[PDB]
Symmetry: none
Subunit: 915 residues, 2 copies
């Protein structure tokens, strides 16, 4: 699903947002533009407030008087936006006019009026958006007004930072934005003193948030370094975030109060307000908080430290203030001043500290302020209760609301994401979900308002407004998953088999109709978890917990494949398995088994809610004993029937059943089976649980799978654990390879192949195609049993050579003198006369021991000394030649095995050359 | 009733049968099959032993080693079958494997094992069934074995004819069929010597029957010509049937003994064993035999002569051997050898005769044999006691058992019949019954076993097994018939009125409850055997012998018709006859009398057991005196009442009674009653015992039954023996026939007809319709009294013709000259001129004597001589004509009676023609 949004109609910019309580129309302040949108975020109307030729430096703007300074077309930023329901209009205060305010008609955005003429009509030079805030308070006629705070930019004479102003009925009327009570001595406004400007050049008050409570007006503000941090002269500026308050009723402005505010987390300081939101707790939070229903609360967001208001730190914390607690702090402070203790301590306002005067008074919450001990500051900074802290991504904005008594908090992030937090200090827990309806790359603004119906939450970005629903639980398929996510909005509507909010679930109020906690689910179990393919229409019992009354009716659906009716008794559901006709359609090609998700389809909703792992196995498919028993499931093998089945009874008879893998029938391995070609030899075998062939059944045979020829030799089964193929000889054609492993299969009764787990094979091995010389044969492995036969002048097994004499010669254990050494080739063909060369000689029939070859090697006359490590017996000799200074130049290489006997010597085909 | 049977399940073949002592299950060896059947002969299980590819010539069969000779699918014949109870299995030794044996599980026929590998595992090449036999003997572990004899077929090196072999617990075990004690010098086996084979080529030992007795093992065998019959060189083979024995305990095989056996009947020799059966005598046979209870007996069957073992002779005899007698013969023989006298004399075994060595020894029955005077033969052939001989149909098999101490013997026949013989040498008698349960066309096999319960006897044929009950007495309706049949099983269960065995009769043990001999019956008599129909509820006394106590109550049932209660007194039963209302329902239409089978219906059983001939007569039905007295029964006739009755008193009065047939009243015959029509004549009659008519009774009349007219003439009874109808004339209309016999009935008092046994009739005779001439009338019988009357020119009785003159002419005795001869026709119309022809002249009124006709005949002029024999007076003349040479050619025939007077001559109507 996608979230409904409004792209910066002026793609160019965006600043403030507000919702009309009755209509749901959304008004959006922006630079050069003010838009009226539908609840859906469709564009209703666009107003052009923008680009005006102007100059910030000029006082009474160009229209009133001529300005020496040059003008340029500049952008008019919507500083503030406030809905005046009574007046049926919108106060949309801009800038770039010296801050002239505009009045737009509610429905059409028709400009009712925009008073420019008088000085009061000008609010502030300040170009920055959001640095201003305020509240509109109204009563019936002859009772009314507007409270607004703004930054000065060092304009102290021109504009007041905080003021109480008049809002006349007629937009045309001159009176607008006039101070409620103006006296030569005191006016309902607060200006910044010139002295304070000189001391600290830049001092300015930026107003972030503001709200009316009970009968007062509060502002969250940011100020400069004044005694904080201490500093003799100007240098760096750090800010202190404070709370301000006024009686609505005080024309005098005596009620002004100002406490610093912040909160700390494990020794980390969070001093700077990003945003705030006044709200209600609802029954849950209020109770543990210890509040009355009416009592208010203030969620806030603060960044770490005192540094860089322009660009704050990522570290940010969401804190909380109970209004009762702040009211107490203020009352506590006042009751103290009335004690006469200490000074007023408000640095920016009063440079010279005036003392507090003691007096008899009943100090109440109602206290509006008096002439003496006039505007005052505060010493003890008020600490707030921390809630959630984000280190990686800074929180920008916040909102909250009461839902079914649980308090949900919304928090914008620098990333363009919203967090949905259930505050559970008073309850018990944390953050439920996070969403990126907004804008994936870059942030969200403080103006974040819930709709009137409270279905959605409009989230504003620099670029776009996004209608983020306070829920999209539908994404969750199962009770287990729904309750699993934890985003507090979601619950499992049992009968509907869907995941949504309480309001959405019909009849959720009724018992067990709606599930909040996983325990309430859905958990399902089937008693016959595994059913064989062969079986049909088996009775199954279903155990389900945390489900609503099913009396509407339920069907069992194994999958999309089938569906069977069920009857309910007790706390169980009884359904039947599918027919054999139906079951195999599924099973085919899945083989061993197929796990299927058996679901329950409710009659009323018609959607599958609950599932379980259901296995269709089916033992019968197994072709062999090993697969049947040895496999992963409970299956029994019938030796006689030679079939695998679940039921013991189905087997031929009692003695026939195979429960254990050892009992199958399988062939055990013995030392490797060596088989010479052309020799008559028996092959004894060992095995286990070999069956005695029953009536109508034949005996055992050994089948050798040789590609050239497959041999069928009958065998005898001596007992349950031994077999033997009868005397026979085997061969393969080709003479290609010495050792050929061959798969062998033991069969009985013609087709029945006994299992061969090890997959034992028979090695058919075949005498010197390779070796013409006696030395080479005796050199070869003793395993081959191949040996040299003197009369033939050839080499073969004893079997192969006739014995006129008692002996054919085999190296008994190397104690066998032989013959005819030959040199195939040697490396380094050439060498230096000086010697030292390593000659590598490769031959066929050399000596078996190193000791004999040593002293044997000679290159011509030159003595050559062989290397032990380098020497590979009868194959190769590595030898190092000595000093060659002799006259020969080139000479043949000679090796004398033990002794230079005439039969015993070998000379190289090509000569070694000295250079 | 039909006998339960099992048809050759393989319709194809059958060989051996055995019964399990506990279960009663019947196992049946066959070619290619071994079956397990229920007691009822239902098929329990079938095993396929059959058709295997093999060849008899090959030694170790194909499985062990390759055979050059070609194989063919051949049938595997079950040579032997033996139940091994201890092992809970069945040893079913086949052939066609070189005789490998198989082990089948008792209950299911599961093949436990079949050892093929070793030489011992092969029994014999021999394909023939039944030529092998043996016994399984078992003891607890560490004591045990199998003794088996088989034919060799000239295989002497390969197999032993008789052996003592091992039967291990495990069928898988290799050890099976190994010799009990094998030594290089001597093994527990006996082989046939090669020398003996060369001398007689074919010599072979065939083992028919075998059994264990006491602590030995005996075999009945057939062998070849060795010194019998004498012969220098090979030629014909005849066999000698002998007995063999061994100690169970002799591993050495020293105990071997061999006596020839047979028996002779009136100079006829029976040398060849067909079958044998060891059994017990029971008290009856044993006593007269002179035996102890434990002592055994051996029934056997032998064919006549020494010839053709393959196909023996029909003549066969059932003989007997008492084991004590054979044991004596053996002991007698041994005690003799120990004397040192003579040689061992065993031709086939020892070619060169070794002498017997004398030694001191206590010669007992226990004697197992010693090293010296080692295996030995026997000189004196042991003769057996003959029992039954069948000339026409050869006995094949035998079995016997003890029943109530009487010894019943069973004998199969070539025909497929079983004989049930009580052996009564020790008792006194012969063969009781014969049955064809089996197979009507063709024979029964030696394996014939009684069931465990001994209710039935399974009789095996080549084709089928038949469950023949050792009794079907129910077929017999009466005590007389039951005991009459003689088949020893049957007895008369008196109270039940049924025929069955002793076991079947409830309370037969008690006195006179069961009848064995005819005397014990049932014999019944009724004192009033004959009762008249007229009588009612007559008292009858019943005499019955050989009947049980009737105090239960008895009813008398004449037939299905009625049943009357009876009371018992003394040794008699008193019942009443049926009422007149009841009796005639039966009698109607049976007439003279109805014999009825009066039965006795017992109260307890409710079945009629005893019967007698009971007559319902009834005299009253007889309508006449003759039927009443003259008939077959005692009935009296009342002349006056004219009714027949049993009681003398019922007659009118004393003088009226007719006891004798002569006295009845009947008409006696006199010379035939001749009655002329139209003549007034009296007819006197004679008769006997004619009644004098009593008051209210009229006199006698004669009634003639003439269809034309029936005449009623009154008559007078002169006395008891004479009657006479009054002067009257009779006639019948038609003139069709001369002599008409007529039935006459003599009646008195209107309706009463007197009896006419002779059935005397009156002959009404009537004058020449036929004869126009005087000669013809006088020619006719003198009886007719018909005569010629001159004046009328016609012929009638004197009565019929008026006498003007004193005479009408009648041939007084042929002395009466007459007239007018006529010739109707003559045969041979034509004749030869030469003459010699026999002329046959037929006329009406010729001469009475031959003498006058001779010389009378002439054909024209030609003289013709008449033949005397040929001549029938006045009807026909046969005459031979003389030489015709005269001129006439054709001429008329003339006859002159005496003289050729003008009145007296006749001439032929047509002339005789000469050609």
């Amino acid at each position: 699903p996608s979230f409904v949004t409004f792209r910066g109609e002026p793609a160019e910019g965006f600043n403030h947002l507000v919702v009309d309580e009755r209509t749901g129309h959304i008004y959006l302040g922006a630079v050069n533009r003010i838009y009226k949108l539908s609840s859906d975020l469709k564009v209703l109307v666009t107003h052009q407030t923008g680009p005006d030729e102007d100059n910030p430096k000029c006082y009474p703007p160009r229209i009133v008087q001529t300005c020496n300074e040059p003008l340029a077309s500049t952008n008019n930023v919507n500083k503030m936006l406030l809905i005046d329901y009574k007046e049926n209009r919108l106060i949309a205060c801009g800038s770039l006019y010296q801050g002239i305010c505009k009045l737009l008609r509610l429905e059409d955005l028709f400009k009712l009026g925009e008073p420019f003429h008088k000085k009061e009509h000008y609010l502030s030079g300040v170009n920055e958006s959001g640095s201003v805030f305020g509240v509109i308070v109204s009563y019936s006629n002859f009772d009314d007004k507007l409270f607004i705070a703004t930054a000065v930019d060092g304009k102290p004479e021109y504009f007041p930072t905080i003021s109480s102003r008049k809002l006349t009925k007629n937009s045309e009327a001159d009176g607008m934005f006039a101070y409620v009570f103006h006296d030569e001595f005191v006016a309902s406004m607060i200006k910044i003193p010139s002295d304070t400007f000189t001391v600290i050049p830049d001092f300015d008050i930026y107003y972030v948030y503001g709200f009316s409570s009970g009968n007062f007006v509060y502002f969250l503000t940011l100020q400069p370094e004044m005694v904080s941090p201490p500093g003799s002269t100007t240098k760096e500026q750090v800010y202190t975030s404070k709370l301000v308050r006024l009686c609505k009723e005080d024309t005098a402005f005596n009620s002004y109060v100002e406490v610093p505010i912040g909160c700390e987390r494990n020794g980390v300081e969070y001093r700077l307000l990003q945003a705030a939101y006044l709200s209600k707790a609802g029954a849950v939070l209020g109770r543990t908080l210890g509040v009355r229903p009416d009592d208010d609360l203030l969620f806030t967001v603060f960044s770490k430290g005192q540094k860089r208001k322009m660009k704050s730190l990522d570290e940010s914390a969401l804190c909380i203030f109970i209004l009762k607690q702040i009211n107490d702090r203020i009352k506590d402070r006042l009751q103290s001043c009335y004690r006469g203790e200490g000074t007023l301590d408000l640095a920016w306002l009063k440079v010279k500290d005036i003392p507090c005067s003691s007096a008899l008074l009943t100090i109440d919450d109602n206290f509006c302020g008096l002439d003496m001990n006039a505007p005052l500051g505060v010493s003890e900074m008020v600490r707030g209760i921390p809630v959630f802290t984000e280190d990686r991504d800074r929180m920008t904005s916040v909102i909250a609301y009461v839902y079914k008594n649980h308090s949900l908090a919304f928090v914008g992030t620098k990333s363009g994401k919203l967090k949905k937090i259930r505050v559970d200090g008073p309850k018990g827990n944390a953050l439920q979900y996070e969403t990126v309806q907004v804008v994936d790359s870059g942030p969200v603004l403080r103006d974040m308002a819930f709709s009137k119906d409270h279905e959605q939450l409009y989230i504003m970005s620099e670029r776009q407004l996004t209608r983020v629903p306070v829920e999209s639980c539908g994404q969750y398929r199962s009770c287990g998953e729904c309750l699993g996510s934890g985003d507090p909005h979601c619950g499992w509507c049992v009968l509907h088999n869907t995941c949504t909010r309480k309001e959405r679930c019909e009849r959720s109020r009724e018992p067990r109709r709606f599930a909040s906690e996983m325990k309430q689910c859905v958990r399902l179990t089937v008693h016959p978890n595994n059913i064989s393919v062969s079986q049909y229409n088996v009775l199954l019992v279903l155990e389900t917990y945390n489900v609503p009354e099913l009396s509407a009716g339920v069907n069992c659906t194994f999958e999309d494949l089938s569906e069977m009716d069920g009857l309910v008794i007790g706390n169980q559901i009884q359904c039947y398995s599918p027919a054999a006709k139906e079951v195999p359609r599924i099973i085919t090609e899945n083989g061993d088994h197929h796990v299927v998700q058996l679901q329950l389809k409710s009659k009323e909703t018609g959607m599958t809610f609950a599932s379980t792992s259901f296995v269709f196995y089916n033992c019968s498919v197994h072709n062999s004993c090993l697969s049947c028993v040895e496999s992963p499931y409970r299956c029994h093998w019938c030796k006689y029937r030679h079939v695998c089945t679940h039921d013991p009874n189905t087997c031929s008879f009692q003695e026939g059943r195979v429960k254990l893998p050892e009992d199958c029938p399988q062939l055990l391995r013995v030392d490797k089976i060596l088989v010479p070609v052309e020799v008559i030899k028996p092959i004894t075998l060992k095995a286990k649980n070999l069956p005695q062939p029953q009536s109508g059944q034949r005996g055992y045979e050994c089948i050798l799978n040789i590609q050239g020829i497959e041999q069928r030799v009958p065998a005898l089964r001596f007992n349950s654990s031994s077999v033997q193929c009868q005397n026979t000889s085997y061969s393969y054609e080709g003479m290609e390879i010495n050792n050929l492993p061959v798969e062998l299969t033991v069969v009985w009764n013609g087709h029945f192949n006994i299992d061969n787990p090890a997959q034992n094979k028979v090695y058919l091995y075949k005498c010197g195609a390779m070796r013409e010389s006696c030395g080479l044969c005796l050199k070869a492995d003793p395993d081959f049993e191949c040996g040299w036969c003197q009369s033939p002048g050839q080499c073969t097994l004893r079997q192969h050579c006739p014995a006129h004499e008692s002996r054919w010669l085999e190296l008994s254990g190397a104690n066998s003198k032989c013959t005819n050494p030959r040199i195939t080739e040697i490396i380094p063909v050439t060498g230096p006369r000086e010697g030292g060369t390593k000659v590598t000689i490769r031959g066929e029939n050399l000596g078996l021991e190193f000791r004999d070859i040593a002293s044997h090697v000679k290159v011509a006359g030159v003595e050559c000394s062989p290397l032990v490590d380098g020497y590979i017996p009868a194959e190769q000799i590595v030898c190092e030649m000595g000093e060659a200074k002799p006259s020969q130049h080139a000479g043949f290489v000679e090796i004398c095995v033990a002794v230079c006997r005439p039969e015993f010597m070998a000379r190289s085909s090509q000569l070694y050359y000295f250079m």
